[PDB]
Design a protein around this ligand. Structure first.
Ligand SMILES: O=C1CCNC(=O)N1
Ligand SMILES: O=C1CCNC(=O)N1
Ligand SMILES: O=C1CCNC(=O)N1
Ligand SMILES: [Zn+2]
Ligand SMILES: [Zn+2]
Ligand SMILES: [Zn+2]
Ligand SMILES: [Zn+2]
Ligand SMILES: [Zn+2]
Lengths: 532, 531, 216
């Protein structure tokens, strides 16, 4: 046959179109879209049975175990995370390279990326991965440092195709001053990088954690209390102001705050290049799940939580992340943002720590270390939820099917196409473009069918995740659809509940400069950078 | 050959994608997208030479001459307007059917559409056309009003595939009360219609016109003065409030006011189904052109108050409703197009001659001494020709000059969204194998040093291929133009030439828009009886 | 406070005077430090009737962190003090000063350029957020920024106890007076300015203040 794979009887969904057509795939790429393709022309033929075909998901916010141990030990390797991603219809992940402050000179940041690429090149990879760079140590003064930082970004991009930098406004050892952010922004704008910010006021978080501990309020639930939405709102506002002054395109990661969404929206209306990411957990969960007591998950249907296991006072740790899962009434605003253009993309902020083993360096119970003066206080809980697998099906069900998202086109826009565009992986990734797209595709089950599919899961279970963690926060909940086929670079890597390891051929992905991240060339004053 | 047409060496632009690929067309439809298509498989092969291929434009706000003469005599027939559309890369137009208040009973509105369809079936049509229904006479009380209107809308949709209704909040004889709007909204929501509003406060317009005339301030320039942006802002706010109360999806036509854009934006952020249209003239022109960066260098426009200052009436060329706004407003129109405020862009094409003074279709119709008309702005027929220039104007001043973010945004607002919001999708608006009518525009290549004699440098009246004697954009530079306009698989426009033998346009029955199903959200516990 | 009262008790005073206290050194961590900062305010009030505290978000040596502001606010609220803030983002001011100097743009006029209204807007917003979290009445001194005025207004509409002060110079002067070249003073009527004395390149210093006199 002339094509490796033909997909017949399906409905193609892109970020702007929904229509019945068929797809031919060859040499790892989309080759052809036509009304009907002769099945004799393909080596493998898949009957979609009227189901949607989407591009594979692109999750640009995944945390994997890495040599520098920035977030301590994480349970998932790149192998584990890509396997999990593919079982849930995500076909590209972007994880994070930790700045190695032991390296100096022009190559220091390229060398930071080298550690990750080298480590993962030895693992079995189920899909492609790219890397963001995390920066927490910025040379001062501003000007003296300009030459080298600029040169260091150039090297990171030239050597490894890293074109995004992530920075924090909170966390001890990660938080950087406004001064340093400006210095970084000077370099990223000059280099056409995607600038990412975790925008919570660290000072406010720090102060309020101390205040709560002083009162003995140290249970998992007070993680949220320590940092209300106003904190995220403030930092986001401050970060927009920096980006404006610096004329730097900026993306806010894992946005969860109505007040943050509001200032983001206002910036977008002004035409400032301000992009934002949110996560399923911020639309689907409220903070009531962190202790024992309709636009989201029925919390009582979740298995192994404070509701089901009230005696286990530590079980709330399963749902502890940053920014925190918010109080009831917040979640609707997150769906609104997804629909109205506030949120450019959706990622998982996938970050896994075991709950049912208590002894390892990658356990949630890491918070108990009597010898290091740690007694399970929320401050010591490793922050994160497993979510790379459940991201796509969660938005398919609770978003599209249940009507919280306006269409399937909106779903594909925020889960597939915009992630590729904003992180320089477009057009290779994110769409269904003949001759151009990597054949990264998801075939779902048909929605209106009375046909039984024994392979189709009814509930979310840990086993379904295909990951290296012993829990998923979404254990026990109903799921109305799942990937039936996940196709990565023209090969079936996931079929009807089974991972096909022999088809695992994921690779490190050198990215380009994003067209969304060229500067607006609009300034607050007459001042311009020297190079302008 | 198995395909009528192959397009090679081009870059496909859709509302979400830009990429190099080739297109095969057969039996009036897009049949195939692939990296490379064997030229021997096609009867005709077009080398795009690296240029963009877009879907044909869809202009959902075009005014054509019609039997009831709502806007008096208009110079363009459906024949003239479709010819002009195609010369400028637009391949579907949606005009307006005037409610015939002489027709009664359940079929009254279907019969209103019949007049237009019958009239135009006798003309040469260069591309497809649909029709909106204009409503200005609504029965009272509400309970009766909303109920016959129900059955009348059903008949209009069932007989003619009309699924949109246009209403006015201004103009004597067109303006309807909020009470009547609610009655119509009750009917349109029940029927999944697209509800359209011209939102200016008619009372304020009327009062201010009389106030100006009393001071002898009657020159064309005072048309703008009689109705500042705050007037459009108010009515738009009021119309959103109605639509909210009534849980009815609503579209605002030809939006020009920052205040109106503001309240629209706020509704959209809330998740309310509020859509909006703007027009090139509102981003490109300021009201300085009516008398004597972001858009057009107004001094480069030929035959205006600047070039002909003696001709006190020449500002009428640029008189429309809502008016061309003062300087400084235009930037916010581009921002709205980029930020999601404006769902679509139309032309509000409405042509009256300037260089002949005597016909019923002339701008000088405003001079009629034995009828107490002496060229006062009130008497100037409102409208600009714009169906032709709409696409190239956004291509140039939008995409090339950087006022729009990308070509994808351009296609979204000019092509795909108009089809979606007006029930023409997926047949129209995109490039979908096996599904799309083959309505496509091949532009000239942008970074080429090659000469194209057929490529226009300036906008001229002749280039418009219309029945009007002027275009408001006469004399201005245009950096790109359609090189090929393909309508249902046939080349109707090629390198400056209209190919009339390939004109095969038809009336277009439309469906219910997926964008206009109601939100099912209410202000109170009250629900429609049927709900 | 004693140092000032003692010094001034020796001078001829034409009218009455009170004193605000300026705080720039705050003990850390907050909880440990609580009892003393509380007790120190009590003493200042009891001994001298000082019931207001001033703090800065800009100026090297005066600028204090959000963390320290919270610590102070904890003490001031408990003691019913009037809490005052100079709200400009010091980090942005510092960074932009260095950037301008690097380009040799060091004339008096660039004082304003170094710290546009958005800088004052940001810090004010941040300070309101602190005051809200801390339930502390707060007053912003010498407000000059539209953006600052906007977030102040919004806070007031919500009913939050946010007060503000402005100054004649911010209503009456524009930054055109700091260099060569209708609701206020006709700037050409001012004597001995860059307009009248263009040769004196330093004369703009007469009108240099913080926050700066703003653009037209
Ligand atoms: O962004 C982050 C770091 C990893 N985990 C988390 O919850 N937030
Ligand atoms: O809606 C309308 C009618 C035709 N033209 C115009 O300017 N407004
Ligand atoms: O608040 C201050 C300190 C001294 N003067 C001034 O201009 N700003
Ligand atoms: Zn984070
Ligand atoms: Zn993260
Ligand atoms: Zn109108
Ligand atoms: Zn109109
Ligand atoms: Zn001060």
């Amino acid at each position: 046959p002339i094509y490796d794979l033909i997909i017949k009887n399906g409905i193609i969904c892109t970020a702007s179109d929904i229509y019945a057509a068929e797809i031919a795939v060859n040499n790892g790429k989309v080759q052809l879209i036509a009304a009907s393709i002769d099945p004799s022309l393909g080596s493998e033929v898949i009957d979609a049975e009227g189901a949607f075909i989407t591009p594979g998901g692109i999750d640009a916010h995944v945390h994997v175990d890495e040599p520098l141990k920035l977030l301590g030990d994480v349970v998932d390797t790149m192998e584990h995370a890509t396997r999990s991603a593919v079982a849930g219809g995500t076909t590209t992940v972007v994880a994070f390279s930790t700045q190695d402050v032991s390296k100096k000179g022009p190559s220091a940041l390229a060398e930071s990326v080298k550690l990750d690429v080298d480590e993962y090149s030895e693992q079995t990879l189920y899909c492609d991965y790219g890397l963001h760079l995390i920066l927490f140590q910025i040379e001062k003064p501003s000007v003296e440092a300009r030459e080298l930082l600029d040169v260091q970004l150039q090297a990171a991009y030239n050597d490894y195709g890293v074109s995004s930098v992530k920075m924090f406004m909170t966390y001890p050892g990660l938080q950087i001053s406004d001064y340093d952010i400006m210095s970084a922004m000077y370099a990223t704008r000059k280099n056409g990088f995607t600038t990412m910010l975790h925008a919570e006021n660290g000072d406010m978080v720090k102060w309020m954690i101390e205040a709560l501990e002083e009162q003995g309020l140290t249970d998992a639930y007070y993680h949220g209390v320590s940092r209300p939405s106003i904190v995220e709102g403030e930092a986001t506002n401050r970060a927009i102001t920096l980006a404006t002054t610096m004329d730097t395109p900026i993306l806010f990661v894992h946005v969860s705050s109505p007040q943050a969404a509001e200032v983001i929206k206002q910036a977008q209306t002004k035409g400032l290049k301000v992009y934002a990411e949110t996560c399923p957990q911020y639309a689907l969960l409220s903070d009531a799940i962190t202790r024992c007591h309709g636009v989201g998950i029925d919390l009582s249907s979740i298995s192994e939580s404070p509701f089901t296991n009230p005696d286990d006072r530590f079980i709330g740790s399963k749902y502890i992340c940053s920014p925190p899962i918010r109080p009831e009434g917040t979640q609707k605003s997150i769906w609104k943002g997804m629909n109205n253009g506030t949120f450019t993309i959706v990622g998982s902020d996938h970050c896994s720590y075991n709950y049912y083993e208590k002894t390892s360096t990658a356990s949630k119970h890491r918070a108990f270390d009597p010898e290091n003066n740690k007694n399970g206080e929320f401050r010591y809980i490793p922050n994160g939820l497993p979510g790379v697998c459940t991201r796509m099906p969660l938005l398919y069900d609770y978003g599209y099917l249940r009507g919280n998202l306006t269409s399937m086109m909106k779903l594909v826009e925020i889960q597939c196409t915009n992630p590729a565009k904003v992180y320089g992986m477009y057009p290779q990734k994110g769409s269904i473009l003949p001759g151009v797209s990597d054949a990264d595709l998801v075939i779902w089950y048909p929605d209106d069918s009375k046909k039984e599919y024994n392979s189709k899961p009814k509930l979310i279970t840990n086993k379904l995740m295909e990951h290296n963690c012993d829990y998923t926060p979404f254990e026990g909940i109903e799921i109305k659809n799942w990937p039936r086929y996940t196709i990565v670079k023209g090969k079936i890597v996931y079929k009807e509940g089974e991972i096909l390891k022999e088809n695992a051929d994921g690779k490190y992905l050198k990215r380009g400069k994003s067209f969304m991240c060229t500067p607006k060339n609009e300034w607050v004053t007459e001042w311009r950078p020297k190079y302008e």
